[PDB]
Amino acid sequence: TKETVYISSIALLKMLKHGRAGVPMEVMGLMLGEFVDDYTVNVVDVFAMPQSGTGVSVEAVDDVFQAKMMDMLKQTGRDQMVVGWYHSHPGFGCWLSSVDVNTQKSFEQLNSRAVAVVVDPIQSVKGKVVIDAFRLIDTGALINIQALIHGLNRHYYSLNIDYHKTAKETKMLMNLHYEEKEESNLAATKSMVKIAEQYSKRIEEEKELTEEELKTRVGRQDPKKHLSETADETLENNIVSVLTA
């Protein structure tokens, strides 16, 4: 019931990339990973099904290309379990499709269990992520139990996602931002070009405050607030330039 999903952020972003552009369509395709003992949903990989001009369906799944890949992937050494289903569900918290369920449901057959990964690629882009994976049924549970034996299990029923990568790509990630020296000091020592503004910016701060202080004579805009946050933003940015000179 508390179940451990694990993603290759690669596969994550791979999907995202595929999913981000996938709008409108729910993106479709494999989900490469495994289950380490229980709870454990591993993902090394995933991939697009190629566009479905029939849209997402239990049908639109083609296992040809997977094998093709999977071979070339096997050739790549790339091999996993297909662990479930991940699609791009514009403005969808909700649930994907009972179809998608049935789609998966047909498929989680092929596993002990699978997922259908909810993604709103819209709501994903927010700088935080929007996502879920359903697989709606249990063994018992973390062992949930009753509605299955009582039949009629339907719901959202998420799984519990996680993922892992490494400190390795983390670097290569945080490598984002020769280099620094070329990248940094010296690369943005450009200031003085704006000294006028840099003045004027600082200049403008002044006025805002006589104003602000004045009200001292209720709630925010308060006479002693934006003052610092204002005259404090031009203080530093104006000191960093000194490093160059």
End-to-end CA, the chain: 61
Q: Least Å distance between CB 154 and another protein?
A: 27
Which residue number, 102 or 141, has a Cβ lying nearer to another protein? 141
Which residue number, 77 or 152, has a Cβ lying nearer to another protein? 77
Q: Least Å distance between CB 11 and another protein?
A: 9
CA atoms within a 13 Å half-sphere pointing along the CA-CB vector of 221: 9
89 marked as binding residue: yes
Dist CA 88 CA 48 (whole Å): 11
Q: Least Å distance between CB 98 and another protein?
A: 27
The strand order across the sheet containing 31-34 reads 4-5, 40-46, 31-34, 81-82
Out of 98, 106, 154, 183, the residue judged to bind another protein by CB under 8 A? 183
Which residue number, 68 or 154, has a Cβ lying nearer to another protein? 68
- Please report whether residue 110 would count as binding another protein according to CB under 8 A: no
After which residues do gaps appear in the chain, with C to N over 2.5 Å? 143, 177, 217
Out of 32, 43, 56, 69, the residue judged to bind another protein by CB under 8 A? 69
The closest of 233, 236, 231 to 208, measured between CA atoms, is: 231
The closest of 41, 39, 43 to 78, measured between CA atoms, is: 43
Q: For another protein, how many residues bind (rule: CB under 8 A)? A: 81
Residues between 7 and 66 with contacts to another protein, criterion CB under 8 A: 8-10, 12-14, 16-21, 36-40, 44-45, 47-48, 50-51, 65
Q: Which two tokens stand for residue 242?
A: 């000194």
Which residue number, 128 or 152, has a Cβ lying nearer to another protein? 128
In this chain, which stretch among 91-99, 100-108, 149-157, 179-187 interacts with another protein, using CB under 8 A?
Answer: 179-187
Which residue number, 102 or 208, has a Cβ lying nearer to another protein? 208
- Please report whether residue 167 would count as binding another protein according to CB under 8 A: yes
Which residue number, 155 or 194, has a Cβ lying nearer to another protein? 194
85, 114 contact by CB (below 8 A): yes
Residues between 113 and 142 with contacts to another protein, criterion CB under 8 A: 121, 124-129
Out of 94, 110, 141, 192, the residue judged to bind another protein by CB under 8 A? 192
Out of 149, 193, 218, 245, the residue judged to bind another protein by CB under 8 A? 245
Element (H, E) at 75: helix 63-76
Residues with Cβ within 8 Å of 159's Cβ and at least 6 positions away in sequence, in order, are 3, 5, 41, 115, 132, 133, 134, 135
87 marked as binding residue: yes
The closest of 149, 152, 58 to 110, measured between CA atoms, is: 58
